[PDB]
Amino acid sequence: MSAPIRFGTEGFRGVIAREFTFATLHRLAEAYGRHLLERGGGLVVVGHDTRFLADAFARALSGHLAGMGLKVVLLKGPVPTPLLSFAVRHLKAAGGAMLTASHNPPQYLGVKFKDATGGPIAQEEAKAIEALVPEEARALEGAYETLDLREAYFEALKAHLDLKALSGFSGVLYHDSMGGAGAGFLKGFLRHVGLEIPVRPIREEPHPLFHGVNPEPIPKNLGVTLAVLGPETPPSFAVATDGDADRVGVVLPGGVFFNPHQVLTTLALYRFRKGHRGRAVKNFAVTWLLDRLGERLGFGVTTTPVGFKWIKEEFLKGDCFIGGEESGGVGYPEHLPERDGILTSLLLLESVAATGKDLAEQFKEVEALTGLTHAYDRLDRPLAGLTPKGVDTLDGVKWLYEEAWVLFRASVRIYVEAQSPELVRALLEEARKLVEG
């Protein structure tokens, strides 16, 4: 029969013109509209990133939903996922749909749904929408408004930043947009609040092929940025936002990569010292330095399986101050129960200005306070000369060691954290031979 449209951890994803076609988009639109009408209808906000035809798919989805009876607002131009999520809450909409494949290769596109709280829909809602996908659908049209909420988004951001402290930043901020939707948002925000902090753009021009790399802010896709920062000096640094800017990667002077674990713990420490209380939420693949920081300084740490839905559920409890993943996505409860790479970039900037220490130095302080050294890598039974100290199968299989951890996840992906990059590499080499044949 017709091609079954199965979702994959929130939303649908596929290769453009293969599984992700206008025909499939309209079937998904029908499912989503029926789902919303069953709950009272309302306003729906639609957005898209810079991927090829994302704009056309978004217009098609908007028209279809409008033709079904939903009030629709399509955000003007490519927008970061967090702006779409913000718009949903700001406009008091029943939900939102974002055309994006985030950090995935150029050929992919997908639809990611947000609920009224301005964050990813829960699994239960995802299943409900999936169940309503019809075998066949029509390219229904309808009238809708197209709005620009950039200014309002900037005003919302302002409310969660220490502008006085920010003005003290003495360096330059490089912003590698990777040809993605985060382009111009950092300069925009600063200009919006009259902060004369210089922002030097890198790959700012929107590009469906993201200038020849995957819009995932990791070393293999950051060659150009690692080069630009090579001869730079502290406290200047670069933030690289992914395709839809819900994630960020950092590059320091000398062309040194500052990973998600370093970003998350550095920001957790900074926010904690500013007085924020409650617990930090992290998925299963996040550094154990966060757990240690929490035990050392006095804040709880909740560990969840991989999937931001788990972090959002906890945020809505109202007793959290930060939530993060090993992929660069970080959420701030008092802002939105969503990953926001733009706010993450601005908080990193704030931390450097307020503390007077560049990111590398702030992380060194994290290592001092935790008493642990950090090294990490990912590749997709005792190992090396390490004596195991237990196993944890919350999500996948994690072998515990003294000062080292090895996680196997059959999504096979091997995540390793150890005291040195050399041990990390050795562990991966020995762990690998365990999945060979």
Side-chain angles (χ1 to χ4, degrees):
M1 291 298 270
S2 180
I5 298 175
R6 310 187 188 301
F7 290 14
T9 301
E10 283 50 295
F12 175 66
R13 186 191 66 177
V15 168
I16 293 161
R18 184 170 288 142
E19 305 102 335
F20 202 85
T21 62
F22 281 91
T24 284
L25 187 277
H26 275 297
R27 290 172 62 193
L28 181 55
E30 187 74 17
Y32 186 50
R34 295 191 186 191
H35 168 69
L36 286 175
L37 288 171
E38 189 285 308
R39 291 190 179 191
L43 170 69
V44 179
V45 186
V46 178
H48 65 86
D49 61 12
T50 67
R51 288 168 185 273
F52 193 76
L53 284 172
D55 55 348
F57 283 119
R59 290 195 297 275
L61 172 60
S62 297
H64 194 125
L65 294 178
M68 290 180 71
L70 290 307
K71 183 175 188 175
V72 180
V73 166
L74 172 67
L75 299 181
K76 182 183 180 300
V79 299
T81 279
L83 171 55
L84 180 279
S85 293
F86 159 75
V88 168
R89 182 185 166 156
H90 188 255
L91 296 179
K92 311 202 69 102
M98 177 78 187
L99 274 292
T100 186
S102 189
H103 63 91
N104 290 306
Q107 64 271 34
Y108 295 91
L109 199 27
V111 183
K112 289 194 170 181
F113 297 109
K114 313 302 183 180
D115 65 18
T117 69
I121 56 172
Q123 183 176 177
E124 293 56 53
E125 179 153 34
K127 286 298 183 178
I129 295 167
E130 182 189 47
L132 294 169
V133 176
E135 291 299 296
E136 189 162 288
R138 331 160 152 189
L140 184 58
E141 297 174 56
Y144 55 85
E145 311 180 314
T146 297
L147 305 182
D148 178 21
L149 277 174
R150 185 175 299 207
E151 289 292 79
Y153 176 59
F154 291 149
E155 279 296 300
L157 288 176
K158 180 183 66 176
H160 306 298
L161 292 159
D162 190 317
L163 301 183
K164 185 174 177 60
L166 274 172
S167 67
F169 184 61
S170 56
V172 53
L173 179 63
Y174 289 81
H175 179 197
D176 177 0
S177 290
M178 306 187 88
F185 278 75
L186 291 178
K187 293 182 180 179
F189 168 78
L190 294 170
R191 166 237 56 200
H192 177 80
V193 293
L195 281 184
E196 304 298 340
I197 295 180
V199 169
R200 296 178 182 176
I202 287 177
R203 294 190 291 202
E204 52 174 338
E205 175 177 293
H207 197 302
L209 290 181
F210 302 94
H211 300 281
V213 299
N214 286 157
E216 192 187 343
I218 56 180
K220 64 164 294 179
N221 302 301
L222 295 172
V224 178
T225 301
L226 289 165
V228 178
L229 274 288
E232 267 304 318
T233 60
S236 296
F237 67 101
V239 286
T241 50
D242 75 336
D244 63 334
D246 70 343
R247 305 176 176 193
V248 299
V250 173
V251 178
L252 304 178
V256 179
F257 184 61
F258 194 72
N259 75 36
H261 306 283
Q262 292 173 286
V263 165
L264 180 61
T265 57
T266 294
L267 288 184
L269 177 61
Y270 177 64
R271 286 166 71 73
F272 173 82
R273 293 175 75 170
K274 278 187 64 178
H276 293 63
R277 246 55 184 178
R279 50 187 178 129
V281 189
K282 55 165 260 189
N283 76 26
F284 203 45
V286 170
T287 175
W288 49 18
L289 260 73
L290 183 56
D291 307 57
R292 177 59 72 77
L293 190 66
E295 75 181 64
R296 282 277 177 101
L297 301 184
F299 62 87
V301 179
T302 295
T303 300
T304 62
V306 173
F308 192 85
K309 62 177 173 94
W310 297 87
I311 295 175
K312 171 162 167 286
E313 182 176 80
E314 295 314 297
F315 270 27
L316 298 178
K317 192 176 298 182
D319 191 6
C320 307
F321 73 99
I322 197 171
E325 298 177 330
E326 29 57 46
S327 293
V330 188
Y332 309 96
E334 27 69 35
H335 172 53
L336 285 171
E338 174 73 87
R339 292 172 288 209
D340 188 332
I342 301 304
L343 180 54
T344 297
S345 295
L346 293 170
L347 288 169
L348 285 168
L349 185 61
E350 187 186 301
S351 73
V352 174
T355 65
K357 301 173 72 165
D358 65 50
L359 295 172
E361 293 307 297
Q362 288 186 59
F363 187 64
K364 297 293 181 178
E365 174 73 24
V366 168
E367 280 173 324
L369 297 175
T370 58
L372 301 171
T373 295
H374 169 84
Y376 171 98
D377 197 11
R378 168 170 53 67
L379 174 60
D380 55 0
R381 310 177 184 183
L383 307 179
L386 310 185
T387 309
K389 191 177 182 179
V391 178
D392 188 342
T393 54
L394 178 62
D395 180 34
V397 186
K398 181 183 295 183
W399 286 338
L400 310 178
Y401 299 99
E402 180 69 3
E403 302 176 55
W405 124 50
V406 181
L407 172 68
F408 305 81
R409 278 178 53 61
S411 176
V412 180
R413 304 182 62 175
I414 302 182
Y415 312 69
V416 173
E417 174 169 41
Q419 218 71 180
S420 66
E422 289 66 37
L423 179 56
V424 168
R425 177 58 181 289
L427 285 171
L428 283 171
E429 286 297 326
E430 303 294 11
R432 195 173 191 167
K433 305 189 301 181
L434 252 39
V435 304
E436 183 61 2

